[PDB]
Amino acid sequence: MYAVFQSGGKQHRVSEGQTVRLEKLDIATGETVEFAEVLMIANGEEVKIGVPFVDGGVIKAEVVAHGRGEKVKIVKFRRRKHYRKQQGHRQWFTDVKITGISA
Amino acid sequence: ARVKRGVIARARHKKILKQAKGYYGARSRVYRVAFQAVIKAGQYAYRDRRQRKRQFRQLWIARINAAARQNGISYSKFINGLKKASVEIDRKILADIAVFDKVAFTALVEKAKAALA
Amino acid sequence: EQKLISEEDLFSTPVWISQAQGIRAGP
Amino acid sequence: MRLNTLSPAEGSKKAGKRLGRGIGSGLGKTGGRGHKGQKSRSGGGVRR
Amino acid sequence: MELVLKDAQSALTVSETTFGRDFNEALVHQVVVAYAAGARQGTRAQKTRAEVTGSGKKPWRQKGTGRARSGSIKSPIWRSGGVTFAARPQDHSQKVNKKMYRGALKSILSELVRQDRLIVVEKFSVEAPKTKLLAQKLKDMALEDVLIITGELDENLFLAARNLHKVDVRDATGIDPVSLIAFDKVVMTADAVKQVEEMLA
RNA sequence: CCCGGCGAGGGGAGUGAAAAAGAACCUGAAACCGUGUACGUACAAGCAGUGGGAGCACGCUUAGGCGUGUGACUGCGUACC
Ligand SMILES: O=C(N[C@H](CO)[C@H](O)c1ccc([N+](=O)[O-])cc1)C(Cl)Cl
């Protein structure tokens, strides 16, 4: 059984026990989150959306970590015109473990 | 108050030759060549963060098309069908479903066929 | 007993006189 | 008040310019002189 | 505005404008920077292209040789005889206004009171010129890193203090801003106060 | 004490805290020159990179399809001043 849901302005196809990396959520690393806007649930049979979102459909999950990902370097560079910069970035994320797909 | 450069200048060069590891010939050996190589690596790196998002979508679309035509509809009609059915599942997920669950994908073709007629 | 050599590699030879010398142009 | 807890007033010690030291400084290359001509030259300029 | 004497138990009445006024951090700092600048032996030099020993002949024929054009084996780009903007002996000393100096002494002295680093006594002297004798006294007063300012340039006291690194002796006339800061405690004689007071007023 | 032209240069022993401090002697970088393993490469055409991205090999991923290397195919892509 998998399900589809939104979160970090992007969608994820997931099953129970799976760990999935989202955009940063304002939730402590031992609390449980529920996602109540789910685009599809599929098991033996499959309930898809009509109105966007499944009617009875809820996904419950546990926040496992906040952290920062690999550093990436931005370089901008205009040749012969005595211009460049360089600049850093590490992006925030929250990792959650799916504990329940409620159909 | 004479200031000698020896220690700091070596450190600055060593940073660059380290960014140039794996490169061919002088580009990994010769600072003057390496420094130009590493910048241009950066210019392309910046660029291909934007390009990456173009390439993958073209892939997803191409795969949905294949699987859509397998159930007897074109990509262009299928997506329109889903939109008028108010299905919002995006093409990263649809291309995934197209591969791993052909039966769910067929069910999305009917859903989109019903709305389109 | 291998003392460094005289070598005599002082190199003030540079630089000798330098005509084209040469093609005629272009008038 | 010890010899290592004294500071100048805020805004008392402006740092002032050091030309021709990289693109980052903003004054690398040229040094605020523009390109070529009399004013760009060493000792270059006209009388009062 | 009264500074209590350590042992005599006879308070001393002083000007609040001298010993009781607020700390001016920016002022004090300027006067300490100028004192240290005033202490330099501005003694150094290098040679310009005019001053290096060597000849005036162009090395090259200007044109025709494949080299970079040259004028001078003393050019600052050349090995040996460089130094584009060579140093001279110079005077690093700075002006301080009479009033900014006195004002600065007053601010620091007033802080010394507030931080309990100033010690007032009736008398401060020593018997025989033996550093050991002074050392005994200083331990007894629980002082170690200390500036002594006395009423007159007392000689025995002066001699006894020379080998003690953490102790300095000074007559009221010879005080300076940085010494009054540079020691953990500062000792002044009653007489020393009256002379310092008149001076700053 | 050996190899060795009663050579050079080496190897042992010995001195020496240390000889990879040995007179071409404090430390001892790089261009450059080597030896040793890992992977790649003889139908495949170009600023030699980057975005994908198969193997194969390591460090077990130290039970968790995790890190390092290498990287076939493939999309973009004419150095710097
Ligand atoms: O140096 C000469 N030739 C130059 C080459 O730089 C030029 O190509 C040129 C050719 C022909 C000519 N002409 O025919 O009078 C003049 C110059 C002389 Cl022949 Cl003028």
SS3 for chain E is CEECCCCCCCCEECCHHHHCCCCCHHHHHHHHHHHHHCCCCCCCCCCCCCCCCCCCCCCCCCCCCCCCCCCCCCCCCCCCCCCCCCCCCCCCCCCCCHHHHHHHHHHHHHHHHHCCCEEEECCCCCCCCCHHHHHHHHHHCCCCCEEEEECCCCHHHHHHCCCCCCEEEEEHHHCCHHHHHHCCEEEEEHHHHHHHHHHHC
Q: Give bridge partners of residue A60 from the DSSP assignment.
A: A34, A100
Question: What's the sign of the alpha-carbon dihedral B43, B49, B55, B58?
Answer: negative
Instruction: With beta carbons under 8 A apart, name residues in chain A contacting B20.
Output: none
Q: Is residue E181 within 8 Å of E201, Cβ to Cβ?
A: no
Helices E98-114 + E190-200 axis angle, to 10: 140
CA–C1' gap, E61 and F58, in angstroms: 64
**Tokens describing residue A84:** 């460049």
Sign of CA dihedral E64, E65, E70, E74: negative
HEC per residue, D3-20 = CCCCCCCCCCCCCCCCCC
Could you tell me the distance in Å between the CA of residue C14 and the C1' of nucleotide F9? 39
Contact list in A for residue D28 (CB cut-off 8 A) is 82
Nearest to A49 by CA among B103, B87, B78: B87
Neighbour tally for E181: CB within 10 Å:
20
CB B57 within 8 Å of CB B94: no
CA–CA separation, A38 vs C8, rounded Å?
Answer: 88
The continuous run of DSSP H or E covering B112 comes out as helix B102-116
C-alpha span between A101 and A57 (Å, rounded): 8
B112: closest CA among B67, B63, B73?
B73
Torsion of CA E102, E104, E107, E113, to 10 degrees: -80
Contacts of D9 in chain E (CB under 8 A): 25-26
Of the candidates E76, E75, E82, E48, the one whose C-alpha atom is nearest the C-alpha of residue E59 is: E75
Rounded distance, CA B56 to CA B91, Å? Answer: 10
The three-state DSSP-derived secondary structure of chain A is: CEEEEECCCCEEEEECCCEEEECCCCCCCCCEEEECCEEEEECCCEEECCCCCCCCCEEEEEEEEEEECCCEEEEEEECCCCEEEEEEECCEEEEEEEEEEEC
Give C7 CA → F7 C1' in Å: 25
Q: How far separated are the first and last CA of chain C, in Å rounded?
A: 66
Q: For D22, which residue in chain A has the nearest alpha carbon?
A: A82
With a CB cutoff of 8 Å and minimum separation 6, the contacts of B92 are A11, B56, B60
Q: Are E104 and E171 in contact (CB under 8 A)?
A: no
Reading the block at residue E5, the tokens are 């004497």
The full length of chain D comes to: 48
Q: What angle do CA E190, E191, E193 make, to 5 degrees?
A: 65
Q: How many CA atoms does the CB half-sphere of C3 hold within 13 Å? A: 1
Provide the token pair at A78.
């205009």
CB contact under 8 A, D8 and E29: yes
| E51-56 contact pairs (CB < 8 A, 24+) | E51/E86, E52/E80, E52/E81, E53/E81, E54/E81
Structure token pair of residue E95 = 């002006």
Q: Please answer yes or no on whether E64 and C14 come within 8 Å at the CB atom.
A: no
A–E contact: 3+ Cβ pairs < 8 A: no
Domain ranges of chain E: 2-200
Q: Is residue C25 in contact with ligand 1, taking CB distance under 6 Å?
A: yes
> Cβ–Cβ contacts within 10 Å for residue A20, how many?
18
**Domain E2-200 listed as CATH 3.40.50.740:** no
Which residue's structure tokens are 């790196």?
Answer: B45
Examine residue C26 and say whether the peptide bond preceding it is cis (omega within 30 degrees of 0).
Answer: yes
Residue in the block written with tokens 């012969």: A80
Q: How many CB atoms lie within 10 A of CB A101?
A: 21
In B15-54, the residues whose Cβ lies within 8 Å of chain A are 39, 42-43, 45-46, 49
d(CA E181, CA D8): 17
Kindly report the nearest CA distance between residue E65 and chain C, in angstroms.
6
Helices (H), B20-74: 31-70
Q: Evaluate: CB of C26 within 6 angstroms of ligand 1.
A: yes
Evaluated on CA atoms E138, E143, E145, E147, the torsion sign reads negative
Q: Which two tokens stand for residue A1?
A: 């059984």
State how far the alpha carbon of E39 is from the alpha carbons of D48, E34, E94, in Å: 40, 9, 10
Residue A62 has which token pair?
């546990």
Minimum Cα–Cα distance from C16: chain E residue: E65
Chain centre to alpha carbon of residue B114 = 34
C26 Cα to the center of ligand 1, angstroms:
5
Tell me if A75 sits within 8 A of B42, measured CB to CB: yes
| Contacts of the segment E156-161: beta carbons below 8 A, 24+ positions apart | E156/E125, E156/E126, E156/E127, E156/E128, E156/E129, E157/E124, E157/E125, E157/E126, E159/E129, E159/E131, E160/E126, E160/E129, E160/E130, E160/E131, E160/E133, E160/E134, E161/E131, E161/E134
Q: Which of E80, E123, E105 lies closest to E175 in space, CA to CA?
A: E105
Residue B46, token pair as written in the block: 């910046």
> Is the Cβ atom of C22 under 6 angstroms away from ligand 1?
no
Whether residue A12 contacts residue A20, with contact meaning beta carbons closer than 8 Å, is answered with: yes
Q: Is E154 on the interface with D (CB under 8 A)?
A: no
Alpha-carbon gap: E64 to the closest alpha carbon of chain C (Å): 6
Cα B108 to Cα D23: distance, rounded to the nearest angstrom? 57
What number of residues does chain C have? 27
Exposed, middle or buried: residue D5 (CB in 10 Å: 0-12, 13-18, 19+)?
A: exposed
Rounded to 5°, angle at Cα B31 from B27 and B36: 65
Q: What is the 3-state secondary structure (H, E, C) of E120-141?
A: EECCCCCCCCCHHHHHHHHHHC
Solved with: cryo-EM
Query: Which residues are within 7 Å of strand F by their Cβ atom?
Result: A 79-80, 82; B 10, 21-27, 29-30, 36-37, 39-41, 44-45, 47-49, 51-52, 55; C 2
> Do E145 and E166 contact (CB within 8 A), yes or no?
yes
Nearest CA-CA distance, residue E16 and chain D, Å: 19
Show residues of chain A in contact with B43, CB under 8 Å: 75-77
Q: Please give the Cα distance from A60 to E148 (Å, whole number).
A: 77
User: Token pair of C11, please?
Assistant: 């190199």
Question: Would you give the distance in Å from CA E105 to the centre of its chain?
Answer: 13
Q: Please enumerate in sequence order all residues whose Cβ is within 8 A of that of D1, keeping only pairs 6 or more positions apart, or say none.
A: E23, E28, E108, E111, E115, E181
